[PDB]
Design a protein around this ligand. Structure first.
Ligand SMILES: Nc1nc2c(ncn2[C@@H]2O[C@H](COP(=O)(O)OP(=O)(O)OP(=O)(O)O)[C@@H](O)[C@H]2O)c(=O)[nH]1
Ligand SMILES: Nc1ncnc2c1ncn2[C@@H]1O[C@H](COP(=O)(O)OP(=O)(O)CP(=O)(O)O)[C@@H](O)[C@H]1O
Ligand SMILES: Nc1nc2c(ncn2[C@@H]2O[C@H](COP(=O)(O)OP(=O)(O)O)[C@@H](O)[C@H]2O)c(=O)[nH]1
Ligand SMILES: COC(=O)Nc1nc2ccc(C(=O)c3cccs3)cc2[nH]1
Ligand SMILES: [Ca+2]
Ligand SMILES: [Mg+2]
Ligand SMILES: [Mg+2]
Lengths: 437, 54, 427, 334
């Protein structure tokens, strides 16, 4: 067994981290106080769930996780939440005042004062690791902490842990649920600095999750709580192969191998189905074909875009529940003949399939109904470049007038870093297009 | 069409089906960037304090 | 996340007292300083503006400043007069005679250190001070002259702290002396340099609202200040109550201020209510939204159709459908998208608090960063020039050591501010 | 009051459309780069589809189908046809064509060129119009461009009097629900010169769009014969109607092309939606068999029909999405 350390940065990262660890506990039969009645090896062991949990002699299973925010409100809700006993104080790191949606403040000003402390608390987790794979890093693009401190953390992790893999779960900014206006700056800045330090990054657009919540969960005005429970389900689907017995995506390294042939283009599109309201008094359970076909509807993607007008480089199907290989292949054959699925010529047209017999666990009192089978598709399509196009355009609109730039310069950042970041993004969009058309 | 590398266990199974074959900065430089920005802040603050002194 | 409050001069102390009496009621604090409310929501962020006293009393983090004791004695004998920390009353005896020079250079200079001592004493008690706020007028001598002197010295001792002002602009309609354009012009340049937010509360607009809309035939300063305290309650709701928004002063300013000098806001409020006059039908969300964007609810007496919105913030209070809020807000913009700049994407932001103010089942506070605010400064500039052409009333200032050059400079950098607004209006 | 932007100033059709919208008083025009639009009359090159449908609370519609260029390019149409089971490759209404690149299916083309060299036939082709394979291939190699080699219809239907050649242009509107509407008014873009069988660089003789022709205006005003006249001619000269002899095939071809690419371009479940006006060009041989020549994604209209067509576009493509406070189209059912 090889361990994985989770790092949650800023408000978005922390609250999503909480939703995920809550879900993890329910899935592995771990109680809020850290006890796991089914774990017969008291005080240790190297089972698959031990990738994410370590054990105390008293029998408590604790998350290999560190929480970091430059302001205490959100992490304090972990300290006093229902899973307060799960973590120990040294996993929760808080600052005094936040980065105020300012990357430069997250990266340079405040980030410099706390980076050594964070790395120290991370080191203490790594010391209890017999064989560390690397890190899963959760954060927003838009926050000053989420963008600024994360990119600095990623740089140092590449230094202190050179051969370890680093994966991102990144919240892409959406105006519907944000009161910020400078997020296009922070996103481009943090993507430029982190790009070489990240092996695989799963982007989640709040716009997509928002509409999925409205359309399929019938929630009129989705809150962060609604958004995070759904996001945690997707994240769980992606990490389940690291926490359970299996042969697909059992290592962080395998995520790059299976999903990322070209290093810079390491942003796989996630699609999830089915999403069913728990208030839906009568639901006809969906078949393998129906949920697999739904993986090619844009309305179910974590980022709204059109894969028909792009090219695939890789594609994984991760099923949970009552699913057998025969019905998957039968579904794929029909979907192939009915849909536009184009691979790049230097890649085989195919699917790597993983099946876990345990159906998705839902949070009691949540919005999601229990289903007999669910699927998460991870596809590396060039169509996700539409998201960079949107972002870079908003960046260009503001930066031409140098709007809000003084806030960044005032924290010690140089104006040229804006243009350097934007040029790197310009290169990225062109990489996607060469591969894509 | 062709199902390969099928692996089974009690928790589930995995396989691969093919439809068709084909056709870093150092600690030194990091700490220098962080300290260059801190200087620019301290320079900007000194220009403000000098201005207020006037 | 403590905020330190400062009120300077007659106007500053009168709207300041009003502000503290309004939010004390919202937080359930009585004039003795004792909490008697029925919601924990009232106390969750009460430390932002209040200090906890042994014997569970809450003491406003407020510093009261004047160059004469007249108005501050009225405060101490006012409704909530006894709630303030007695040591935080800092006052001289000589007065300022509506003279910026007296407030900024002579009389105020003699008292300013004493004020800073109290500021420091209140700051050192703060776990993490997020910033300062100041209430004052620009047309007199103390609030205008000593207030900006104060702001300059606070920025010297706390260069990394947010400073926001609620500033009452002078108008011939509601006028005390003829030298108000002089004092205002001198003050505006100080504000351009040393504040992060300045809420431009125009006495002209406040008058017109009380008259044309609230149908008060002879409005007093008291009527005018009812609108101000109601607006200040709304502007700070975000900070005083839990909800969608938990930004500190800095984060709030970052998303509202695209250029450092253009931080003068047009505030607004809906529904517009005169004091005492109850009315029983609450507004529908389309009514709230349409009024808060209408010029008649603006408190800066500028026509927003004569400029363009750089950023807009709106806070809705009460029990209501935010989905309906979303639709009406995006109704207004998509209808009038020519009065919003197109190079700042999604520059119109909204938030809701469940707790309505006293007397209303729902309300909305408007905060517009419009280029139309240049009309306010052009107005002051014209009135400045009309007298300065003939060097009229200048002897009041030269007698305190000021030179004509300082006026010429003040005049020029306000004209720069005006032209700077014109630059982005045509972008 | 809805909003729209205009990003193609040289569109004859949508200049007319935008003015119709304004004259309703329920549509307001914004300028080019204002993202808060309901309707986008977009540019023809590099239209930013990826930025559509991401404005909260705004239904967005664009007058172009993303991906429809595979139908509206000559190199693409041949390949789209040739590789799609719904059409190809025994497709009876599309001329034998091949994809040729300058120094690909070059070897494939001459394998066909030979066998009715190698016995019986007309072997005239087009890109220039020639009968000699060699004369085309190094025409093609000093253009630079990628060209298409297509069998020349040596037996076209010829209008009398005049012994003239012609091509038929049909206008097809596809709405956001992928309804296929055929404009009841087509036009015959005729040749004013009599057709010359023997010599082929006559080109005034062999090429029929209303640019080259300007014997102009001899028979009909502007070398444009509309459907009422052409129908009357078919009745008088051939004892048949336009509907039976030609239009059934046209309707069949239009529906078949658009049904093929529907799954590739449909916006039924997208976050934005599309409609698009197409111009189908047909060719009729002497046995009243219809052939598809090409498809234009940015067609212009005939002058008399601008008022009717553009009004039709507003009614069923735009007002169907954004309503306001017997039909000129034939719906090709599927
Ligand atoms: N999905 C999701 N998005 C969130 C959540 N919280 C904040 N966001 C998004 O994150 C962006 C704002 O960044 P935050 O994470 O809140 O800020 P931060 O990382 O704490 O950084 P600073 O507050 O500036 O120091 C906005 O676009 C929000 O929509 C959350 O709980 N779930
Ligand atoms: N295979 C063929 N056989 C006979 N004639 C043909 C032909 N292909 C084209 N033509 C003639 O050559 C002319 C030019 O063809 P083409 O359609 O390529 O021009 P074009 O691209 O300008 C049409 P549009 O302007 O509507 O897009 C047509 O008008 C037709 O008369
Ligand atoms: N809105 C409002 N304006 C006032 C009030 N009192 C004075 N003013 C205005 O403030 C200016 C006079 O400044 P004042 O505060 O009296 O001078 P100071 O005491 O020396 O600071 C004039 O423009 C008055 O119209 C008040 O209570 N409310
Ligand atoms: C005392 O100083 C302030 O209150 N400044 C201040 N600046 C502000 C900017 C915005 C808001 C606000 O309520 C928002 C509503 C919707 C988006 S921001 C509130 C603010 N308050
Ligand atoms: Ca164990
Ligand atoms: Mg934060
Ligand atoms: Mg006075």
């Amino acid at each position: 067994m090889r361990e994985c350390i989770s790092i949650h940065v800023g408000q978005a990262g922390v609250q999503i981290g909480n939703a995920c660890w809550e879900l993890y506990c329910l899935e592995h039969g771990i109680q809020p106080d850290g006890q796991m009645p089914s774990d017969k090896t008291i005080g240790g062991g190297d089972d698959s769930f031990n990738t994410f949990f370590s054990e105390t002699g008293a029998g408590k299973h604790v998350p290999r996780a560190v929480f970091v925010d430059l302001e205490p409100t959100v992490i304090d809700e972990v300290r006093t939440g229902t899973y307060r006993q799960l973590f120990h104080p040294e996993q929760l790191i808080t600052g005094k005042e936040d980065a105020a949606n300012n990357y430069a403040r997250g990266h340079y000003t405040i980030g410099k004062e706390i980076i050594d402390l964070v790395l120290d608390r991370i080191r203490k987790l790594a010391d209890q690791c017999t064989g560390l794979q690397g890190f899963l890093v959760f954060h927003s693009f838009g926050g000053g902490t989420g963008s600024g401190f994360t990119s600095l953390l990623m740089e140092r992790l590449s230094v202190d842990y050179g051969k370890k893999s680093k994966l991102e779960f990144s919240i892409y900014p959406a105006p519907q649920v944000s009161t910020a206006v400078v997020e296009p700056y922070n996103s481009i800045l943090t993507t430029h600095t982190t790009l070489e330090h990240s092996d695989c990054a799963f982007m989640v657009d709040n716009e997509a999750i928002y509409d999925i919540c409205r359309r399929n969960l019938d929630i009129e005005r989705p809150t962060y709580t609604n958004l995070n429970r759904l996001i945690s389900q997707i994240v769980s689907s992606i990490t389940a192969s690291l926490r359970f017995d299996g042969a697909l995506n059992v290592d962080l390294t395998e995520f790059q191998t299976n999903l990322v042939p070209y290093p810079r283009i390491h942003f796989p599109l996630a699609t999830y189905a089915p999403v069913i309201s728990a208030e839906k008094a009568y639901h006809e359970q969906l078949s393998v074909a129906e949920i697999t076909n739904a993986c090619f509807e844009p309305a179910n993607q974590m980022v709204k875009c059109d894969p028909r007008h792009g090219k695939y480089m890789a594609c994984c199907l991760l099923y949970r529940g009552d699913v057998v290989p025969k019905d998957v292949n039968a579904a794929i054959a029909t979907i192939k003949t009915k849909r536009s699925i184009q691979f790049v010529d230097w890649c085989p047209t195919g699917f790597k399939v993983g099946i876990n017999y345990q159906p998705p666990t839902v949070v009691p009192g949540g919005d999601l109904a229990k289903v007999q089978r669910a699927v998460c598709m991870l596809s590396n399509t060039t169509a996700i470049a539409e998201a960079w196009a949107r972002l870079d355009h908003k960046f260009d609109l503001m930066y031409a007038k140098r709007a809000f730039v003084h806030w960044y310069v005032g924290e010690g950042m140089e104006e040229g870093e804006f243009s350097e970041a934007r040029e790197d993004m310009a290169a990225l969009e062109k990489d996607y297009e060469e591969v894509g058309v | 069409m062709e199902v390969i590398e099928l692996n089974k266990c009690t928790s589930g199974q995995s396989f691969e089906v093919i439809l068709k074959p084909p056709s870093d900065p150092s600690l030194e430089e990091i700490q220098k960037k962080l300290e260059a920005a801190e200087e620019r802040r301290k320079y900007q603050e000194a220009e403000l304090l000098k201005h207020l002194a006037e | 996340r403590e905020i330190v409050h400062i009120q300077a001069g007659q106007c500053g102390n009168q709207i300041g007292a009003k502000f503290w009496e309004v939010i004390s009621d919202e937080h359930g604090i009585d004039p003795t300083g004792s909490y008697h409310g029925d919601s924990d929501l009232q106390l969750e962020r009460i430390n932002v503006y209040y200090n906890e006293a042994t014997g569970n009393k809450y003491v406003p983090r407020a510093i009261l400043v004047d160059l004469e004791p007249g108005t501050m004695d009225s405060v101490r004998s006012g409704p909530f007069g006894q709630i303030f920390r007695p040591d935080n009353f800092v006052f001289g005896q000589s007065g300022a005679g509506n003279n910026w020079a007296k407030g900024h250079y002579t009389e105020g200079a003699e008292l300013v250190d004493s004020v800073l001592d109290v500021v420091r004493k209140e700051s050192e008690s703060c776990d993490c001070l997020q910033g300062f706020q100041l209430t004052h007028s620009l047309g007199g001598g103390t609030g205008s002259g000593m207030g900006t002197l104060l702001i300059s010295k606070i920025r010297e001792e706390y260069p990394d702290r947010i400073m926001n002002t609620f500033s009452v602009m002078p108008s011939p309609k509601v006028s005390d002396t003829v030298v108000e354009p002089y004092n205002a012009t001198l003050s505006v340049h100080q504000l351009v340099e040393n504040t992060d937010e300045t809420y431009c509360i125009d006495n002209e607009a406040l008058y017109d609202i009380c008259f044309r809309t609230l149908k008060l035939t002879t409005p007093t300063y008291g009527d005018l200040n009812h609108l101000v305290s109601a607006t200040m309650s709304g502007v700070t709701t975000c900070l005083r109550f839990p909800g969608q928004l938990n930004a500190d002063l800095r984060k709030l300013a970052v998303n509202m201020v695209p250029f450092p000098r253009l931080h003068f806001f047009m505030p607004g409020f809906a529904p517009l209510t005169s004091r005492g006059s109850q009315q029983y039908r609450a507004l529908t969300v389309p009514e709230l939204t349409q009024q808060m964007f209408d010029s008649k609810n603006m408190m800066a007496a500028c026509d927003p159709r004569h400029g363009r919105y750089l950023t807009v913030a709106a806070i809705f209070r009460g029990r209501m459908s935010m989905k309906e809020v979303d639709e009406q807000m995006l109704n207004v913009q998509n209808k009038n998208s020519s009065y919003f700049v197109e190079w700042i994407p999604n520059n119109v932001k909204t938030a809701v608090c469940d707790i309505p103010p006293r007397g209303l089942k729902m309300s909305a506070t408007f905060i517009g960063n419009s280029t139309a605010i240049q009309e306010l400064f052009k107005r002051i500039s014209e009135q400045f020039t009309a007298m300065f052409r003939r060097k009229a009333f200048l002897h009041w200032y030269t007698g305190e050591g000021m030179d004509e050059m300082e006026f010429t400079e003040a005049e020029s950098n306000m004209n720069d501010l005006v032209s700077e607004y014109q630059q982005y209006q045509d972008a | 009051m809805y909003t729209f932007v205009v990003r193609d100033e040289n569109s004859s059709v949508y200049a007319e459309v935008s003015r119709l919208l304004l004259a309703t008083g329920q549509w307001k025009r914004l300028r080019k780069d204002n993202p808060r639009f309901n309707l986008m009359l977009g540019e023809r090159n590099r239209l930013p589809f990826g930025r559509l449908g991401h404005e909260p609370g705004l239904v967005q519609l664009v007058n172009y189908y993303r991906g429809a260029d595979k139908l509206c390019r000559k190199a693409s149409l041949v390949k789209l046809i040739k590789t799609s089971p719904e059409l190809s490759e025994s497709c009876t209404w599309f001329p034998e064509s091949y994809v040729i690149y300058p120094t690909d299916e070059r070897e494939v083309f001459l394998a066909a060129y030979n066998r009715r060299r190698e016995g019986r036939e007309g072997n005239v082709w087009i890109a220039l119009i020639s009968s000699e394979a060699s004369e085309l291939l190094d025409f093609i190699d000093e253009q630079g461009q990628v060209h298409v080699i297509q069998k020349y219809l040596e037996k076209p239907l010829l209008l009398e009097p005049g012994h003239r050649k012609f091509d038929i242009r049909s206008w097809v509107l596809v709405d956001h629900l992928y309804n296929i509407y055929l404009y009841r008014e087509g036009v015959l873009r005729t040749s004013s010169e009599p057709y010359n069988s023997a010599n082929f660089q006559d080109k005034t003789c062999h090429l029929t769009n209303h640019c080259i022709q300007k014997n102009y205006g001899r028979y009909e005003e502007g070398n444009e014969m509309f459907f009422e006249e052409f129908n009357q001619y078919l009745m008088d000269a051939l004892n048949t109607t336009l509907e039976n002899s030609i239009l059934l095939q046209i309707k069949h071809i239009i529906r078949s092309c658009l049904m093929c690419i529907e799954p590739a371009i449909s916006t039924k479940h997208l976050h934005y939606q599309s409609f698009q006006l197409f111009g189908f060009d047909f060719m009729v041989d002497e046995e009243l068999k219809v052939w598809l020549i090409e498809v234009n994604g940015a067609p212009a209209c005939a002058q008399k029909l601008y008022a009717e067509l553009c009004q039709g576009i507003v009614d069923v493509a735009i007002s169907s999405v954004f309503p306001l406070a017997t039909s000129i189209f034939i719906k090709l059912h599927h």
